């Protein structure tokens, strides 16, 4: 009653994305929609479990560099990833070569997962960059060339362990690449024309959501003493600046983007009012007792 909806067994589309429609996957693979246009999938959604597994692998690597695979599927315009799987590769923090150990490891792990009951396939790979941002190098560009031109459904992931640890936010970067021939900012590197970037999103199930909320529930002091909107001021100002640029672009276009601008403005306003609401609730609870 207090939570109203609660959950005994009911779910929604959030829990629906975890399945394997064999006929649907077969027909999208056979139709091959992305082989006809270069500007295909721009949305990549990766589950939480894969994220933490990648982060732990990168941290266990230390100052050196690690490298592993990933598992998932593709659905329409979007890409779904929900598994991480590390590899036993070694090398200097500036270069790593996959020896025969990884070649015998990926196949063995795939067979073990198939025996377990897993049904997904290889979708890409993740490589850790210890310090030098998140950008594909020349050898990475060539490897992504060959991988996306031989194994069309693919995507690369680059993270920065050191900067993630120091700053406090993750450095997940999902990249697809433009094939050879199609020709039509120093941070991204020197091959900025050959490779581009993609947006990142996350999901979690109903059971995962309940477990995460109940585990994070042992954070009450920080929960009611955080006083947000005083820590994310720079983020909100940057969001408003990007809102202004998007609004200008939409106004120029009118002479759609307006829907995207409206959604972004709604998100920022919702965050601001949520911060104000938490502040008001704290003031009501603490400052209105004993006169």
């Amino acid at each position: 009653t207090w939570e109203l909806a609660n959950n005994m067994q009911e779910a929604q589309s959030i829990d629906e994305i975890y399945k394997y429609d064999k006929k649907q996957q077969q027909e999208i693979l056979a139709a091959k929609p992305w082989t006809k246009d270069h500007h295909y999938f721009k949305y990549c959604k990766i589950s939480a479990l894969a994220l933490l597994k990648m982060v732990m692998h990168a941290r266990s690597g230390g100052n050196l560099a690690v490298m592993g695979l990933m598992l998932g599927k593709v659905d329409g315009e979007t890409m779904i990833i929900m598994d991480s799987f590390a590899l036993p590769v070694e090398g200097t923090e500036t270069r790593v070569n996959a020896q025969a150990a990884a070649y015998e490891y990926m196949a063995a792990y795939i067979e073990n997962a198939k025996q377990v009951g897993r049904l997904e396939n290889a979708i890409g790979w993740y490589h850790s960059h210890p310090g030098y941002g998140c950008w594909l190098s020349g050898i990475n560009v060539s490897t992504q060339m060959l991988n996306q031109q031989f194994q069309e459904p693919f995507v690369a992931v680059v993270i920065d362990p050191t900067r993630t640890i120091s700053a406090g936010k993750v450095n997940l970067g999902a990249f697809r690449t433009y094939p050879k021939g199609y020709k039509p900012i120093e941070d991204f590197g020197v091959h900025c024309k050959q490779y581009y970037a993609l947006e990142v999103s996350y999901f979690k199930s109903s059971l995962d959501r309940k477990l995460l909320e109940l585990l994070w529930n042992k954070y009450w002091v920080n929960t009611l003493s955080s006083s947000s909107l005083l820590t994310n001021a720079d983020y909100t100002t940057g969001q408003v600046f990007d809102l202004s640029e998007k609004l200008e672009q939409s106004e120029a276009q009118l002479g759609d983007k307006l829907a995207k601008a409206t959604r972004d403005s709604c998100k920022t306003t919702i965050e601001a009012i949520h911060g104000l609401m938490s502040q008001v609730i704290k003031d009501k609870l603490f400052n209105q007792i004993n006169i």
């Binding site: 693979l29 490298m67 500036t94 270069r95 790593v96 070569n97 996959a98 025969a100 070649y103 015998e104 990926m106 196949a107 063995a108 795939i110 067979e111 396939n121 290889a122 790979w125 490589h127 190098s137 050898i139 990475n140 490897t143 060959l146 991988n147 031989f150 194994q151 459904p153």
Partner: protein, 76 residues
């Protein structure tokens, strides 16, 4: 003579091999059918990489056990 090759992405290849054929020969044919580069194939048979020097001599098999091919994938 009717061997099957399954990759980790889903591509299925059906190839015909004489039992006494060399390993370079089978790579050459599978590159002809699909388009693999001539020197960049890793081939796995029953959880064991096929040695290039060791030519195939005894294929005591009619289906079932399948060699999975994988590409060299490396970064820096």
């Amino acid at each position: 003579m009717l061997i099957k090759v399954k990759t980790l992405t889903g591509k299925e290849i059906e190839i015909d091999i004489e039992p006494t054929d060399k390993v370079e020969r089978i790579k050459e044919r599978v590159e002809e059918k699909e388009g693999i580069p001539p020197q960049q194939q890793r081939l796995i048979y029953s959880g064991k990489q096929m040695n290039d020097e060791k030519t195939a001599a005894d294929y005591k098999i009619l289906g079932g056990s399948v060699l999975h091919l994988v590409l060299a994938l490396r970064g820096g």
